Scaffold this active site. Structure first.
Site, PDB file in Angstrom:
ATOM      1  N   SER A 151      51.570 -24.131  68.634  1.00  0.00           N
ATOM      2  CA  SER A 151      51.525 -22.675  68.614  1.00  0.00           C
ATOM      3  C   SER A 151      50.146 -22.099  68.316  1.00  0.00           C
ATOM      4  O   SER A 151      49.967 -20.881  68.450  1.00  0.00           O
ATOM      5  CB  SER A 151      52.592 -22.109  67.676  1.00  0.00           C
ATOM      6  OG  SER A 151      53.878 -22.476  68.143  1.00  0.00           O
ATOM      7  N   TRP A 162      52.945 -26.246  64.976  1.00  0.00           N
ATOM      8  CA  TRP A 162      53.740 -27.418  64.639  1.00  0.00           C
ATOM      9  C   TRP A 162      54.228 -28.006  65.955  1.00  0.00           C
ATOM     10  O   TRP A 162      55.110 -27.454  66.621  1.00  0.00           O
ATOM     11  CB  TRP A 162      54.880 -27.029  63.719  1.00  0.00           C
ATOM     12  CG  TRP A 162      55.590 -28.141  63.065  1.00  0.00           C
ATOM     13  CD1 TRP A 162      55.627 -29.448  63.445  1.00  0.00           C
ATOM     14  CD2 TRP A 162      56.419 -28.030  61.913  1.00  0.00           C
ATOM     15  NE1 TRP A 162      56.420 -30.171  62.579  1.00  0.00           N
ATOM     16  CE2 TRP A 162      56.926 -29.315  61.634  1.00  0.00           C
ATOM     17  CE3 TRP A 162      56.759 -26.977  61.070  1.00  0.00           C
ATOM     18  CZ2 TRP A 162      57.765 -29.567  60.540  1.00  0.00           C
ATOM     19  CZ3 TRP A 162      57.603 -27.225  60.011  1.00  0.00           C
ATOM     20  CH2 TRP A 162      58.084 -28.507  59.744  1.00  0.00           C
ATOM     21  N   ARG A 191      51.329 -26.840  55.091  1.00  0.00           N
ATOM     22  CA  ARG A 191      50.100 -26.496  55.796  1.00  0.00           C
ATOM     23  C   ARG A 191      49.360 -25.384  55.052  1.00  0.00           C
ATOM     24  O   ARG A 191      48.153 -25.473  54.791  1.00  0.00           O
ATOM     25  CB  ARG A 191      50.439 -26.072  57.231  1.00  0.00           C
ATOM     26  CG  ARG A 191      51.045 -27.122  58.089  1.00  0.00           C
ATOM     27  CD  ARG A 191      51.699 -26.609  59.334  1.00  0.00           C
ATOM     28  NE  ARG A 191      52.786 -25.682  59.023  1.00  0.00           N
ATOM     29  CZ  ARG A 191      53.417 -24.944  59.930  1.00  0.00           C
ATOM     30  NH1 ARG A 191      53.124 -25.015  61.211  1.00  0.00           N
ATOM     31  NH2 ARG A 191      54.375 -24.109  59.543  1.00  0.00           N
TER      32      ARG A 191
END
Ligand SMILES: [Cl-]
Ligand SMILES: [Cl-]
Ligand code: NA
Length: 233
Positions: free
Chosen positions: A43, A182, A220
Site C-alpha cells: 500500500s 503490508w 510498524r
C-alpha cells in the site's frame, strides 16, 4: 549508541528489519541488508497511484468511490469512501478501481517517469504493487519520500499537496506524513512505514520489516516512532 538502540527494537520484536533515514542516507536496525533488497511496495504505492490519478483527472479529492456490495477482504472497506478515506484505511479495492481508470499504458509511463523502484508494473494493471513484479528497496522508498516532501516529484505542486493532505498523520509542536504498507499476498510478508518529518528541515524515513504471521500492524508504527525518538524527535 543510536545503532545499538534501534537494533534492539527489531530484536525484541523477534523479526528482521531496517529503517532508513535521509542528502545523506543512514540505515539502522537488525538486518541492514534489507536496505539493499527490493520488496513489493504494497500500500505504499497508494501515494503514487493517487498522484497519477489526480494529475491525469481520473478522480477528484471529493469523489466518493461507491461500494458495489461485493464482499471485500475487510468489512472496514465495505463502505463508500473518498480517496483520502481509502488512503487512511489502505482500502485496496478503491485504489484498484483508480488504477483501472488510469490504465496500464499511462500507469507504466508515469511509473517510469517517476523512476519508482524497479519500474516494472508488468501486464496486470490492478495488482502489480501487491504481488509484483513491481518492487522497491527501502532506500528507494526513502528517496521517493524525500522528493515528495520537497515537492520534487514530476507532478504539479498542487497535485503533490493534495495527496499530502491524505497522508498527514501527526502534528505536534512539526508534522509527520506517512503511508503504511503490508504485503500479505507475498511470502514472507513485508511491512512498511514510509514518510517524513517536517520540523523547517525535512527528514525522510522508511521502515521495512518482515511481518511474521500474526504480528500486529502497530509494530510498524511502534518501531518507527521509537527509532525517531531515539534519534531525537
Ligand atoms: Cl476540505
Ligand atoms: Cl488477480
Ligand atoms: Na495502490
Amino acid at each position: 549508541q543510536h545503532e545499538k538502540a534501534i537494533k534492539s527494537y527489531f530484536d525484541e520484536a523477534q523479526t528482521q528489519g531496517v529503517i532508513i533515514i535521509k542528502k545523506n542516507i543512514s540505515t539502522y536496525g537488525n538486518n541492514l541488508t534489507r536496505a539493499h533488497t527490493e520488496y513489493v511496495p504494497a500500500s505504499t504505492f497508494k501515494m503514487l497511484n493517487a498522484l497519477i490519478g489526480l494529475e491525469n483527472h481520473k478522480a477528484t479529492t471529493t469523489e466518493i468511490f461507491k461500494w458495489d456490495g461485493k464482499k471485500r477482504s475487510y468489512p472496514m472497506w465495505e463502505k463508500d469512501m473518498t480517496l483520502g478515506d481509502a488512503m487512511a484505511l489502505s482500502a485496496v479495492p478503491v485504489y484498484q478501481e483508480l488504477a483501472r481508470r488510469t490504465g496500464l499504458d499511462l500507469m507504466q509511463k508515469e511509473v517510469k517517469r517517476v523512476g519508482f523502484g524497479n519500474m516494472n508494473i508488468g501486464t496486470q494493471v490492478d495488482n502489480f504493487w501487491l504481488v509484483g513484479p513491481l518492487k522497491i528497496t527501502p532506500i528507494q522508498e526513502v528517496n521517493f519520500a524525500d522528493d515528495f516532501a520537497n515537492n520534487r516529484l514530476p507532478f504539479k505542486l498542487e497535485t503533490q499537496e493534495e495527496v499530502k493532505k491524505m497522508l498527514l498523520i501527526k502534528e505536534f509542536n512539526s508534522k509527520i506524513y506517512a503511508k503504511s504498507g503490508w504485503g500479505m499476498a507475498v511470502t514472507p510478508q513485508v511491512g512498511w512505514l514510509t514518510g517524513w518529518v517536517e520540523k523547517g528541515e525535512k527528514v525522510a524515513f522508511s521502515l521495512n520489516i518482515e511481518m511474521k504471521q500474526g504480528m500486529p500492524g502497530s509494530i510498524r508504527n511502534e518501531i518507527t516512532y521509537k527509532s525517531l525518538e531515539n534519534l531525537g524527535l
